[PDB]
Design a protein around this ligand. Sequence first.
Ligand SMILES: CS(=O)(=O)Nc1cccc(-c2cc(-c3ccccc3)cc(=O)n2O)c1
Ligand SMILES: CS(=O)(=O)Nc1cccc(-c2cc(-c3ccccc3)cc(=O)n2O)c1
Ligand SMILES: [Zn+2]
Ligand SMILES: [Zn+2]
Lengths: 176, 182
Amino acid sequence: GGLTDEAALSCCSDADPSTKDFLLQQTMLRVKDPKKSLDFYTRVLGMTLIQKCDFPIMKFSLYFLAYEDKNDIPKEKDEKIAWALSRKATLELTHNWGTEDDETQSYHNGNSDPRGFGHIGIAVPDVYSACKRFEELGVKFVKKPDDGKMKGLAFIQDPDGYWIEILNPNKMATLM
Amino acid sequence: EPQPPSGGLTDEAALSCCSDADPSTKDFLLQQTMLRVKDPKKSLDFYTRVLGMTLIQKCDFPIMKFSLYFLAYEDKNDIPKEKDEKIAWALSRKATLELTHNWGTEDDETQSYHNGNSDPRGFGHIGIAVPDVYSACKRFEELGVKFVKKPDDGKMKGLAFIQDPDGYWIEILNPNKMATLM
Ligand SMILES: CS(=O)(=O)Nc1cccc(-c2cc(-c3ccccc3)cc(=O)n2O)c1
Ligand SMILES: CS(=O)(=O)Nc1cccc(-c2cc(-c3ccccc3)cc(=O)n2O)c1
Ligand SMILES: [Zn+2]
Ligand SMILES: [Zn+2]
């Protein structure tokens, strides 16, 4: 069986004062082709590319996507990195150079053997209107809002096949 | 001297693939990152005691034999007591971690999840911004935390990777001391 609410609470500790300003800054996913991924995250999902970092010595690039206003991105280089890497809730897309030209290469989404990571999730004001727009855009669905047991909750996929949950926080309590 | 090769995209080519955010997406937020955890007792102790996150919501689904534990950097005094209000508040917080416990995994010694950092790769890590990478890592060392990369080991100094009980990687970074690494 699972843990009781009390058994879970007993495993939790209060926050040490040295961690009081820590923030959950990024989730990193590797992407085969950044051209496809940037188009999906910006045009389809509405995120903004807030920082791009190239590491020629190590043959990779990092793309930082976030729900931020493009006009808040600083003009100066060093000021840019400090601002982008201090935003909460960013998505870091790692492009290992050359994967886009390797026809046999693909990344694993974590939802089949071996499992681990499952998904990222976007909270939206209306799951149905968001998903009607995704359908019009040709987005691939793992779960349409009214498919299966949990109504009003969807899973779409990005170009690498990573799962993205689409949820409305105000319509979740009814699923319990 | 000759310069190292320049692969991938230029800044301008990357921006050629970016479109302005559609106004219908104006209120969207990146709410959660889901990771499967073998033993929620160990994971809750790690994320709360070591990292200072708070358990904001616990969901149990007996028919499906799993539980969800939502962790976030939120004040515990902001957690509503009433069930419906609590769910709406927790699931509307930005930057939460959803830990999935498939019941029974904690009893199976031969069971473990994949961290995405060995074949087959995909997900890499979550990352926490801190005021001081060095003092945070000194404390993690005192607490017996497993490291992937100490701050001054490897190519990029002042950036660390630790691991949680399932072996997922967690980057520890100070955004004010990253620009000097370029
Ligand atoms: C066991 S699994 O790995 O297949 N995952 C899974 C399956 C079904 C629903 C949800 C889910 C529910 C909920 C939820 C539903 C109702 C109330 C609160 C949370 C939140 C959420 O983020 N997710 O992903 C998660
Ligand atoms: C390419 S990889 O799969 O091996 N991952 C990886 C390894 C080491 C560091 C970084 C990193 C750097 C930086 C960074 C460093 C300096 C300046 C700007 C960003 C940010 C960041 O989030 N990460 O993860 C990423
Ligand atoms: Zn990172
Ligand atoms: Zn989820």
